[PDB]
From a paper:
We have checked the ability of EDTA, O-phenanthroline (OP), and several readily available metalloprotease inhibitors to block TldD/E action, using angiotensin II (Asp-Arg-Val-Tyr-Ile-His-Pro-Phe) as a test substrate. OP and natural product actinonin (deformylase inhibitor) efficiently prevented angiotensin II hydrolysis by TldD/E. Interestingly, EDTA was ineffective at preventing hydrolysis even at high (100 mM) concentration; as were phosphoramidon and bestatin. Actinonin was therefore used to produce a co-complex structure with TldD/E (see below). Subsite S1′ is more enclosed and deeper, being bounded by the side chains of His262, Trp256, Val259, Val463, and Val465. In the actinonin structure, the n-pentyl chain of the ligand projects into the pocket, this being a mimic of a Met side chain.
Residue numbers in the entry:
A (entry chain B): 6 to 450
B (entry chain A): 2 to 481
Amino acid sequence: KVISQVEAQRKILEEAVSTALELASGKSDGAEVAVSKTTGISVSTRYGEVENVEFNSDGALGITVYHQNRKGSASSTDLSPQAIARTVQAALDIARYTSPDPCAGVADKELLAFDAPDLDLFHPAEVSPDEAIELAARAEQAALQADKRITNTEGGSFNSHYGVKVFGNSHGMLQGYCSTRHSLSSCVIAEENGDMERDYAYTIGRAMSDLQTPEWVGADCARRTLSRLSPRKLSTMKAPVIFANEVATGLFGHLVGAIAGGSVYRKSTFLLDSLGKQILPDWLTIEEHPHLLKGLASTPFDSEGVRTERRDIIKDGILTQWLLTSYSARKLGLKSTGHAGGIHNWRIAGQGLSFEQMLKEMGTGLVVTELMGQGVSAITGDYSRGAAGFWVENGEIQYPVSEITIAGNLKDMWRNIVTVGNDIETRSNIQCGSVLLPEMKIAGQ
Amino acid sequence: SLNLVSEQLLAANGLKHQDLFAILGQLAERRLDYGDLYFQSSYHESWVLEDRIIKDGSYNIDQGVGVRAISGEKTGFAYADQISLLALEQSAQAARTIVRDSGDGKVQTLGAVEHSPLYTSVDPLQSMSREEKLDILRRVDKVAREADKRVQEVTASLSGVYELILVAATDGTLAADVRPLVRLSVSVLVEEDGKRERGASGGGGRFGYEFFLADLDGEVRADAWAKEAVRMALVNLSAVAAPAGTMPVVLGAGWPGVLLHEAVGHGLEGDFNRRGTSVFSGQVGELVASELCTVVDDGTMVDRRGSVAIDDEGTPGQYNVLIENGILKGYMQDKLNARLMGMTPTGNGRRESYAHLPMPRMTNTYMLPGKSTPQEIIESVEYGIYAPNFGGGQVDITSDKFVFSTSEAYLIENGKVTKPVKGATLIGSGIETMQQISMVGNDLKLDNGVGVCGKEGQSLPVGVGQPTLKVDNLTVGGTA
Ligand SMILES: CCCCC[C@H](CC(=O)NO)C(=O)N[C@H](C(=O)N1CCC[C@H]1CO)C(C)C
Ligand SMILES: [Zn+2]
């Protein structure tokens, strides 16, 4: 039945885009309009009882217009015809006061997804609040009952939403798509000898039937939380570092900002001179897969309506391309690569070792499992972040560690990766296993 | 303000006082401790200069209603991006489903009370011409570029928000606010012999854009900040590797008050303490910081970015002493957590918008000044770091571990500030770090009006402050 609510919403959104474009058309050289609507439920439990029930409904329309290469933008959450009219007028008025900028404008017609692919992103569920509560409660209760050292809770949580997005522009593109996301988590607190620790586990997917069970979530939550108890603060040292899979994804994630066209044309990236250079090991390829069916970050077009493409961003260690949008492409004398709004599923294969085998290879060193702070310079690659994780000796985890930092430079870190594990994290945009680096500076006692 | 806001949010949308009664009544059909209606309309603009031209401008509008039903620990919540009777009815009928049992229906009569004005009700978007606003950005560009030949790029942005809110609750609260907020941000890139670095400055508060053209220590504020961004960039360009490990750290006055925001601020929000999940839970009356430390959260500061004439529950902003001479005095609250803890609202019940739940949140968090001069503090260090500016920070309130990352820092060698060092993340335990504060300066200042605090995905304008202070032992995430 929810399919009908979504199809009604989609028709309304399509009409809102067409209305906005027509209102802009006689007064601008170009215009781009995006609208979205997201609806669903978010629930939490505390000690297995309902805590919060939140009903979500968010809508939005944005327009950008261009005249004499001058741009103006406006947005509204109200999608009434009169609100749309006011929004269009506001953008047009702004464009009288901004300066001509020839790199600005609607994306090139030759790059637009006029006939956008169906990526099967929409798997709705009629989950009632009571059903949502029971899933959250089950996850939380499974964590709480795992071990008597679990003495408090931050709850179970369940989220289920559907979305409709429509984009159009003055080249005649008008395409939209629907999507869903569902997730289930729990987060509990353990104590030992006057030390409290918190950790969490979760499952996420586009279809409810892709989720791990509540009991799986709770068991993982408890396992992770209990593993943090009674940490040591390491002494200041140099040692090898494994980025556990869950933070290894973020290690590769820093690449996005460093090869973004916006950073490149402004010369504000440490990789400015690295296009076609080997910045990673010669066996390492980062594959982008924007059209994976049901993919967590799949998209049929970027935020400027540009087609998304299968590309090897890194191929055998070599940086093959920048991540360009229409504006940054134009600054560089290039064409958009369909990266307005970010990256669309990165995949990095393992090199054959399990996490356990990686511990044995390293022998002695630090496993980082959680990082804190920004501490990454876009312009130099300098890296300094707070860390928690585990000390490893004799190829075995010895004790958890916290209240330490890890420091280095991304250029050196990336180039000298020893291996990547087969323990792939599969809940994220970037998916990879654990990553072994030969040395970082660890600050501590 | 209440009559003006009521005319704009209620009367203009076909609503009367008696509709408020009807909707609160619908909530009170259920067995609730509390219910509220939160109305909002807001207007945001931004303008950006880059490559010596006005590149971009935006105008963004939002409005809506949010409705909560609360019973003990429990909150039902629904909202709509429109202010209408139907939106209110739909939202109340969803929110009240948090409990099935009938209530007695006994609500308190709605009645507004006065609160102290903390900022103008004049709309900052309409109070200066567009070309005058753009002239602010043009002057920032010219000043930054003239400051040093190595300046190659300048991005300067101006943003302004005008927001009306009204809140009505089953406990009789009826209150409104009119909230202006403006911000100027400047980013510069410097280049020398193929080496590049960046610097930033800016600020603002709850007033019109004229503030950026007003005098700051004998110069035009915009000009002073343009020069500061360049200065920061050039320092960073010259910086060498930071040392690694535990050492004394002297923090500058102002924005380095991120220390307090992370080390104690979030940990003293009442939601975590009511649940027992904060390291500070049950520690009222204990020594949680050195005896030189008195930390306040102050929502009452005229014109400041982080202030709240009323919070989002209608509670007027307060000067709340959290830590007094090292002793924990209490927590920041919202109405839910105050009731559960047997305490009272403190003026810390804040929500990002009508589309989000309020929770306990900071306003302006700062440490009171002490007796030491900043020079005396620097002179006390044989080897360590002086960090007069930071980026951001983060805390885990359960394990009591926090970080914050330098944006300008120097070695101290033999009681003198010497070489600039590269950005480093500093890490410590909150309580243990506060207990290591051995000198507190006589030079309190707050940040320029730049802070955004995040909690549970909700961003808010928040201030920090402190004098210069010395932390005897803190772990510095350098490489050297
Ligand atoms: C009042 C907030 C104090 C700083 C802490 C916050 C994050 C936070 O809420 N931590 O608990 C932050 O880093 N905010 C940053 C921040 O506000 N900054 C970073 C540099 C200056 C200022 C500019 O907005 C960014 C990430 C938004
Ligand atoms: Zn914060």
